[PDB]
Amino acid sequence: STAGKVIKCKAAVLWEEKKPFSIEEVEVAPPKAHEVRIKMVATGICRSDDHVVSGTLVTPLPVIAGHEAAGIVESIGEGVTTVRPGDKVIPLFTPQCGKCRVCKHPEGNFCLKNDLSMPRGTMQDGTSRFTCRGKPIHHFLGTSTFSQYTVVDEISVAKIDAASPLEKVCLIGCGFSTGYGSAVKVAKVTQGSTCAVFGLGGVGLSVIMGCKAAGAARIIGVDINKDKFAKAKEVGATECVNPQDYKKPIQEVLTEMSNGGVDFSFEVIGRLDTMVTALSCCQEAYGVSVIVAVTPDSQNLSMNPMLLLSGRTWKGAIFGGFKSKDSVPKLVADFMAKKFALDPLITHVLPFEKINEGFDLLRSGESIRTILTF
């Protein structure tokens, strides 16, 4: 009744930069070969989506943003073997084609088929499945979750547990996995270790959860906003420090606190100065610092290579270093097995149509995570 034909539905369309999202009636074309049309159930509002709005993250416009979500497959194109109609799925903004050098590399996850490096805003075949009043609308990171229905390439979708709560597990689409993975996959936090987390937002909390799951003895939360501390401690933080409370530089305070420097530090703010501070606070001989965020309007940080010569390791990653398709299902399984809680991260839930309001909450910073429901 719906398969093989165009679907008329609503979607949040961004027509121009620095403009509010426009709830428009759009036409979502049927999935071609190796494609998957998905009926959205829930989608999170991530800072990256906002970067598209402010023109910070350059991608073709008009566009249907959104990359953190979960839904139900309504139909599949010819050749699709990984998912079936009715399956609960999560779109992967970072694809896993499984064929490129990166997918075949044991340490890589940034699939060369990504639309992040040089954004085209289309399906893998160079075209779009979206039209508004006969006018073509671009895709976003092969996901475009700000729509009641979306069409994604098979390499950009993962089948998850059929009994999982999509209003919660949608965070696995970006926020949670990014933070959690930075701790568990990128840094590879060891038991009894001391960790320092800069920035206690949603991703920051997820990093803490990862350090906790990894068995870190100490997890020091760092944030200039004291209101973020309670949640941080609730999710795993042993201590919380505010740089504004001190007269001496924060890396100095952290070095003293950890008697020589922390084992693992994470920068989850995307600020040039704290990235350097995060690196500097980890132990000089074996300290590991992970870059979990950087603003799209790329500016250069200033740093002394001496910090690295002593023995430190500096590394970053997208999607917490997780090979998307392989990891997402297992992360949902862990959530289903009660291995971790996602509720502490959800601070607001609004119906999809109030998308602009959800962004006001994001921009104001009073929201850890707003989830849009369909």
Ligand X SMILES: NC(=O)c1ccc[n+]([C@@H]2O[C@H](COP(=O)([O-])OP(=O)(O)OC[C@H]3O[C@@H](n4cnc5c(N)ncnc54)[C@H](O)[C@@H]3O)[C@@H](O)[C@H]2O)c1
Give the catalytic positions in this structure. Answer: 46, 48, 51, 67, 174
110 binds, among its own copies, ligand X, Zn ion, none (CB under 5 to 8 A by kind): its own copies
Site for ligand X in 293-322 (CB under 6 A): 293, 318-319
- Binding region for ligand X (CB under 6 A) out of 30-38, 76-84, 144-152, 194-202: 194-202
Which tokens in the block code for residue 177? 């996995």
DSSP one-letter string for 7-46: EEEEEEEB-STT---EEEEEEEPPP-TTEEEEEEEEEE--
Cis peptide bond upstream of 91, omega within 30: no
Which tokens in the block code for residue 45? 């509002």
Tell whether residue 180 is a contact of ligand X (CB under 6 A): no
Go through 89-100 and write b for each residue having 16 or more CB atoms within 10 A of its CB, e for each that does not. bbbbbbbbbeeb
Residue 149 or 319: which CB sits closer to its own copies?
319
Backbone angles phi, psi at 237, to 5 degrees: -60, 135
97 binds, among its own copies, Zn ion, ligand X, none (CB under 5 to 8 A by kind): Zn ion
Tell whether residue 202 is a contact of ligand X (CB under 6 A): yes
Tell whether residue 101 is a contact of its own copies (CB under 8 A): yes
Instruction: Return d(Cα 51, Cα 57) in angstroms, integer.
Output: 5
Q: Which of 73, 76, 92, 110 binds its own copies (CB under 8 A)?
A: 110
**Closest distance between its own copies and the C-beta of residue 327, in Å?**
15
End-to-end CA distance of the chain: give it in Å, rounded.
20
Residues 6+ apart with CB under 8 A from 25: 8, 9, 10, 132
315 binds, among Zn ion, its own copies, ligand X, none (CB under 5 to 8 A by kind): its own copies
DSSP one-letter string for 137-156: EB-STTT--SBSEEEEEGGG
Tell whether residue 276 is a contact of Zn ion (CB under 5 A): no
Tell whether residue 308 is a contact of its own copies (CB under 8 A): yes
Which tokens in the block code for residue 186? 């990128």
Site for ligand X in 232-261 (CB under 6 A): 243
Write each residue from 97 to 126 as x if it is in contact with Zn ion (CB under 5 A), else as -, in one continuous string: x--x--x-------x---------------
Tell whether residue 48 is a contact of Zn ion (CB under 5 A): yes
Instruction: Return d(Cα 18, Cα 16) in angstroms, integer.
Output: 7
Residue 124 or 194: which CB sits closer to its own copies?
194
Q: Which of 59, 122, 124, 178 binds ligand X (CB under 6 A)?
A: 178
Residue 83 or 141: which CB sits closer to ligand X?
141
Quick one: angle between helices 272-281 and 250-257, nearest 10? 20
Instruction: Return d(Cα 364, Cα 38) in angstroms, integer.
Output: 31
Pairing state between β 88-91 and 69-76: antiparallel
**Closest distance between its own copies and the C-beta of residue 178, in Å?**
11
190 contacts 209 by C-beta, under 8 angstroms? no
Tell whether residue 272 is a contact of its own copies (CB under 8 A): yes
Give how many residues touch ligand X by CB under 6 A. Answer: 28
Tell whether residue 191 is a contact of its own copies (CB under 8 A): no
- What residues line the site for ligand X (CB under 6 A)? 46-48, 174-175, 178, 198-204, 222-225, 228, 243, 268-271, 274, 292-293, 318-319
- What residues line the site for its own copies (CB under 8 A)? 101-102, 105, 107-110, 112, 117, 260, 272, 275, 283-286, 291, 293-294, 298-306, 308-318, 321
